[PDB]
């Protein structure tokens, strides 16, 4: 869960290598997209559409051992100054678009990095973030220009708890090679494989190796029931200055007027040259 | 004045330097009808290079080519210097547009037979110009000393380590040391701002002189 | 005087045209028609386009260099995408260096390999056009693959 | 880093420039020269 | 534009704008004739 | 992407109109 990322990496979810700390426990890697506007104006509310795609007909195993639906979750690291718009400023259309989604700043004064989840995947495969852009006119520590927007989104259960223990949503292996030949349901979907080498399979996965066979060292004892996964993506957003665009428009219009005048001057010189030939 | 139309103080220069010789040399050339809009591409490359010569120039007044200040100087340009964002962004975009215009120029030259006899030397010096432009881009990519540029230079500089004998010496020569550090940044700044401007100026002089001597290629 | 015809009654112009040169001696005058009135149009167009790209898509500062943390995605500029690709899928690093160095050295042999015929029109040199189209397709395919995981860099996705 | 706008400009200007060059070559192919 | 992922859109826009520049230059040429 | 089409159409129309107006006006006042 996102708060486990808060507990494991409390300073930032993105390591110095650019990898979100959510990949330490969520091992699978799938697609996760963010639709952010290419440029946004200062002190304007815009929607960041985090698409967290996965087929809705594939059900993952749960903690108890039974199968069930998935729960999406995401972390959106915005540039400094950006934050989730309060319910007061965002519009009524955006109010009905975001629904009752809850966003946390992941930290105090770090409101640019906002986490969300676990939300059910049956209706939250597409999450709208009502981002609020800063205004470098009021805030002097914030500048215009292009900045990076990072995203890390997850679908299924994590492999590893913050205590290092393994969940039942992963493939289990052998400590080494031996002859177990001991398969028995431990009053649930889990097995206890014991030449005599101790290993316990929880209720989640299903055994793939046949009993009474000399298994190799570090080989998959069960299959991998990991339907979900974690995927990250970085894009860029331009905090644009309207004055820049106004002067750009003026400059380009002047350039095109100059080009028109240059062509007219060439036409006049062409007529002059035609006169100089037909003397 | 178009070239020279009606002048009286011009005689002071013409009696000394014979400027009318230059006037009649420029006004003696003609543009053949087979010259399309695609013949403007190579000159456009020059245009972009001039922007690189200009906006790069400006950025030499604030960029500190040291590993403790390269990133700081780049963000000082972007945030604190007046119009520094504009100069740096123009430099980046005009580098990309220089490479693009040069690629389109190669396409035009190959697709109009502008390299064939007697323009072989023009094409060879053009390829050398292209290598110089790629070297500009490579050496300027690491100047900000951000993480992408630093890792791009650390990857491209360790490539010569595959050559059996002279590999280590080549890697050290391109890096200026064993690893990518301050020596690499100093050598790459010298390449980007001193070595390559002069090299590309010499190559451009050769290129333009050959074009002027041999004229444009014939019709297709 | 809009267009000047080539005076074929001139032995020097005829010799230059036989040698391949002399094509800057007919047509519209270069000055001031083209160099003074058409060149600044392209100059101002390039200036406006580059300034607009700078304003609308400003350069990004990035993250300060960390010699101890490699980014998940590392890439040169766009024009180095094919060569970079050649570096990363070729298992023999020497072969990758050879492939990266054979582009400038192979491009200088174009005026000498194709010195067999004096045909400038592409439709009169079909082998050259096929080779050039294959080269453009290969360069674009490698550049596109350079923005993919090393496993998918070959097929780009395969439908 | 990938710049989608720059790559779009490149991939929009390369094919159209090649097509225009081939079209001009064809136009000069189906007619005569200046002399 | 005001919409990101300008790779495919950028390519299509560049192609269309080059063609339209040629076409409009010819249109102005035709409309300038006395 | 849609209103941008309208802005582009109007902008081309305005600049083509001023181009033709300048050309025909300077032809009318014998400047060309």
């Amino acid at each position: 869960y996102p708060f486990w990322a808060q507990e494991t990496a409390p300073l930032t979810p993105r390591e110095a290598t650019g990898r979100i700390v959510c990949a330490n426990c969520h091992l699978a890697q799938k697609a996760a997209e963010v639709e952010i506007p290419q440029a946004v104006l200062p002190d304007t509310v815009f929607e960041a559409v985090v698409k967290i795609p996965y087929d809705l007909d594939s059900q993952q195993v749960l903690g108890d051992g039974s199968k069930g639906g998935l729960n999406v979750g995401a972390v959106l690291m915005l540039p400094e100054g950006f934050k989730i718009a309060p319910p007061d400023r965002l519009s009524e259309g955006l109010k009905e678009k975001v629904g009752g989604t809850y966003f946390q700043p992941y930290r105090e004064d770090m409101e640019n990095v906002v986490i969300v989840g676990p939300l059910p995947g049956e209706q939250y495969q597409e999450i709208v973030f009502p981002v609020l852009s800063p205004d470098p006119a009021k805030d002097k520590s914030i500048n215009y220009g292009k900045f990076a927007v990072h995203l890390g989104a997850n679908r299924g259960r994590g492999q590893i708890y913050p205590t290092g223990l393994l969940s039942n949503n992963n493939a289990f292996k052998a400590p080494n090679a031996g002859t177990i030949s001991e398969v028995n349901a431990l009053e649930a979907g889990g097995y206890q494989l014991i030449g005599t080498e101790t290993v316990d399979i929880p209720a989640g996965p299903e055994l793939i190796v046949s009993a009474g066979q000399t298994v190799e060292a570090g080989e998959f004892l069960t299959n991998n029931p990991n339907v979900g996964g974690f995927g990250q993506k970085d894009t860029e957003v331009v905090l644009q200055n309207p004055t820049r665009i106004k002067f750009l428009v003026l400059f380009l219009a002047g350039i095109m007027l100059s080009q028109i005048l240059l062509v007219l001057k060439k036409k006049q010189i062409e007529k002059v040259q035609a006169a100089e030939l037909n003397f | 004045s178009k070239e020279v139309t009606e002048s009286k103080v011009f005689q002071w220069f013409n009696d000394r330097l014979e400027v009318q010789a230059i006037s009649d040399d420029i006004a003696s050339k003609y543009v053949p009808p087979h010259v399309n809009i695609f013949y403007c591409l190579g000159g456009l490359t020059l245009t972009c290079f001039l922007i690189q010569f200009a906006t790069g120039f400006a950025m030499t007044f604030y960029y500190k080519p040291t590993v403790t200040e390269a990133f700081a100087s780049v963000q000082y340009i972007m945030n604190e210097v007046n119009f520094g964002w504009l100069i740096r962004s123009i430099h980046r975009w005009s580098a990309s547009m220089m490479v693009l215009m040069m690629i389109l120029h190669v396409f035009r030259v190959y697709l109009t037979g502008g390299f064939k006899k007697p323009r072989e030397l023009t094409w060879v010096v053009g390829v050398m110009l292209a290598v110089t432009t790629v070297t500009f881009g490579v050496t300027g990519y690491s100047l900000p000393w951000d993480q992408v540029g630093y890792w791009a230079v650390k990857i491209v500089s360790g490539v010569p380590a595959a050559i059996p004998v002279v590999g280590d010496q080549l890697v050290t020569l391109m890096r200026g040391s064993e690893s990518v550090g301050q020596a690499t940044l100093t050598r790459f700044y010298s390449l980007h701002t001193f070595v390559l401007p002069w090299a590309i100026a010499v190559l451009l002089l050769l290129h333009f002189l050959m074009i002027r001597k041999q004229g444009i290629s014939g019709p297709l | 005087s809009i267009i000047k015809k080539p005076d074929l009654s001139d032995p020097d112009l005829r010799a230059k045209l036989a040698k391949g040169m002399g094509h800057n001696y007919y047509g519209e005058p270069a000055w001031p028609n083209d160099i003074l009135y058409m060149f600044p149009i392209c100059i101002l167009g390039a200036l406006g386009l580059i300034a607009g790209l700078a304003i609308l898509d400003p350069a990004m500062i990035g993250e300060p260099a960390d010699p101890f943390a490699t980014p998940l995605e590392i890439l040169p500029e766009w024009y180095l995408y094919p060569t970079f690709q050649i570096l990363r899928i070729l298992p023999n690093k020497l072969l990758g260096i050879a492939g990266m160095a054979a582009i400038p050295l192979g491009l200088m042999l174009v005026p000498f390999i194709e010195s067999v015929n004096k045909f400038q029109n592409p439709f009169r040199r079909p082998i050259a056009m096929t080779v050039f189209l294959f080269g453009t397709a290969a360069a674009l395919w490698l550049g596109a693959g350079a923005t993919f995981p090393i496993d998918k860099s070959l097929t780009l996705g395969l439908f | 880093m990938i710049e989608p706008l720059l790559l779009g400009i490149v991939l929009g200007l390369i094919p159209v420039t090649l097509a225009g060059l081939f079209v001009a070559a064809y136009l000069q192919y189906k007619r005569g020269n200046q002399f | 534009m005001t919409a990101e992922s300008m790779l495919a859109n950028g390519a299509f826009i560049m192609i269309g704008l080059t063609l339209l520049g040629l076409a409009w230059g010819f249109v102005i040429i035709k409309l300038q004739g006395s | 992407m849609a209103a941008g089409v309208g802005i582009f159409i109007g902008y081309i129309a305005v600049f083509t109109g001023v181009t033709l107006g300048l050309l025909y006006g300077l032809r009318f006042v014998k400047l060309i």
């Binding site: 095109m256 | - | 058409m38 609308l56 | - | 704008l17 040429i29 | 902008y11």
Partner: peptide, 29 residues
Amino acid sequence: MDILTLGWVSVLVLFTWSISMVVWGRNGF
């Protein structure tokens, strides 16, 4: 009345208009 749209359109139409003016001034493509 979008300023970002106005700037993008201005750049695009500068590209188109530069092409058209080079075509018009040189009197053909």
